[PDB]
Symmetry: C4
Amino acid sequence: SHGRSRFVKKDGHCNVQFINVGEKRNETLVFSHNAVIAMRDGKLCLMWRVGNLQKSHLVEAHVRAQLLKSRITSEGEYIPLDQIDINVGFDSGIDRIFLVSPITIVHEIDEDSPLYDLSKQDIDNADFEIVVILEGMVEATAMTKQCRSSYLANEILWGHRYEPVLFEEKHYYKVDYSRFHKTYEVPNTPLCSARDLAEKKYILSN
Amino acid sequence: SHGRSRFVKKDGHCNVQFINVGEKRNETLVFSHNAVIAMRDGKLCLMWRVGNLQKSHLVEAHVRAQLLKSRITSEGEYIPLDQIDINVGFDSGIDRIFLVSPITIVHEIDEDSPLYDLSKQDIDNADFEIVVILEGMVEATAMTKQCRSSYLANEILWGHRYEPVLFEEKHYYKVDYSRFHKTYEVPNTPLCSARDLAEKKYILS
Amino acid sequence: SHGRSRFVKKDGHCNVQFINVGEKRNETLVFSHNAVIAMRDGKLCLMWRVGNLQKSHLVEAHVRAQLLKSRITSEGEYIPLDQIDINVGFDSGIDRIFLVSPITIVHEIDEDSPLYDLSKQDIDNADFEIVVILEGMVEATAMTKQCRSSYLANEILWGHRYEPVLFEEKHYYKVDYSRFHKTYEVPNTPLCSARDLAEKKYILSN
Amino acid sequence: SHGRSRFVKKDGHCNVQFINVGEKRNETLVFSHNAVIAMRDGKLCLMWRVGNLQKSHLVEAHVRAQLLKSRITSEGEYIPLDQIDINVGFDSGIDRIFLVSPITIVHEIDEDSPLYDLSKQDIDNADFEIVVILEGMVEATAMTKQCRSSYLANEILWGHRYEPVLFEEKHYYKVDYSRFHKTYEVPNTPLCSARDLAEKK
Ligand SMILES: [K+]
């Protein structure tokens, strides 16, 4: 379950060629146009993809995501912008990434997730916004980066997975960026909420 | 709920226009002149507002605060300056902020807070200083920023909340900086300490 | 609580004037020549002092300490340098400091400390080395500094406390650097180990 | 348990002389050519050595490792590259290293390690890759570095330990870089998995 070639050479260079990158952009960090919700290892997850269009070192790279909404407190205070962080692994250190080929960032929709109670229908009807961020510092250029994007509820594709971008050649790996934004539908995905899923699971565990 | 327009565009540009920022001199990181103490979601909180009025984003930003006072140890040792950390979310990572429009930083006055035993009258009589800090990197460079301010006990407004600065236009959001330092009164705010409120919550149950 | 003058002005200027700073140095971060062991609120602590003579603030400053020794594993492996981290607050974030006036860094000698079993007599006959480090970015240039020093066991003053350096004037605070390295002696300090202290406290209550 | 001389002088200078660094292909050489698996204090450990960069001395330094492989989820999804972080002390802060002389980084193969079930023969039949990373800031600058290397399963030497590189002289310590990549064999090393070593205690 590893390809023929090494992914990282002994000298630290990655053994990867990027193809179909398009026009050499000034910002080389990029997020997928859509986010997805799908099952992974028995858990309902929100995911989004991030990549570096070139072979630079993003040092001390890490990701965050926040749900953006207004809120009224119990005291009647109006909060125009409540920025609610969504768990992508801060507390265990797995928000920190080693970015070579595009990575799918994963938020598990568990009881602590803002999305725990949302079914496909709920999302279809909703108006919320998730901002996603990738920060680190590019080694060669000494530039601290904060790549930002946003998914509105209508840009999250319930029941989709990303197309593979990373392929093995005999001597190296290629990343096909023509597949970066591409997704496919998984009809087998539950349409109900993570909460419903956990209830249906307990009922069968007995 | 959400305004009509997106806050952050797909290309990462923040959909926000700043108004009433004033002269050149004022295009920096800034803290509100006052801090406030008020209830939020059934908890008494110390809050203060921070903003960025420059053209450049502050990357990997995070906040701290410390109460400054002298202290005598039980051994009789005089400590001229004790810098007692005030919890604004370090342990869960919520001290890390994504700073676009001005943010109200929140210290919950819980059992571990230096302010747990203090009522409005205690703050009135007190002379401590709370130093506030905002740090981060200048986007697209290797440079750093540290913004420092402080609030004397007499600059903390018990039973106040900040005026909103963030308003919805049809295609974008505006930040009105003329409201940044402004507050309103909440006469409803309890005048006792967070400890006392924690007790009045047993006398209920 | 507090002096007449604020310590930090609204504009972030610190209201401090430094006097008796040797003058014109290489290395403007400095550690006290000695470390001390003394009681602080019922607990035996190892302390050392750090100062900032820069023209600038030290941004994202934080401290560490390590005990340096060789050791042999149970398998017979010789480790020429085992670097044993000494707790100065990492786990709650209080290893992070806002360094204006000299700060006394405190290591509580508790059950998890390498020094838990060491009495004044033990230290008098010991040969270990404790390296102390202060890291951060110079505000003006983002230069990352790592200020390092070292205390051999014989450079630790059992039963000493630092002389105050920070004094109140009418409108400002003065930091007298002629007192930076100075200590005074506290004859009342127990001579036994932190573990002995914990046992006696236990015996007293039971 | 301490040499005659101090390792760090009062002024912060480290009392270490580096020798036999060579015209070495890279002055960028940071990681040992091989990783090892061996017992250390009754635990089976995966280890590898890292030195500081000769010409870019790194501070605020810290290490990471990941196991790289493909996997299929239970839903049938093919993941070309799963990057599973390997514990080297993040949670307690001991992933942060004060890197003067070459340090042997230690991943304890416990119940939570991806290697927990692998015996010497399992590693022989394996094709996985372990990426190792060192990051820090170049001392006295605002510049940053990420140094990488990699160990294929067949580059991990079961039952080996590194040769010492750090040596006491009278007034200082020398780091003999001629021994950096060298190992010795410990025939005494158990050949079973860390799971099996645990399930006999
Ligand atoms: K933690």
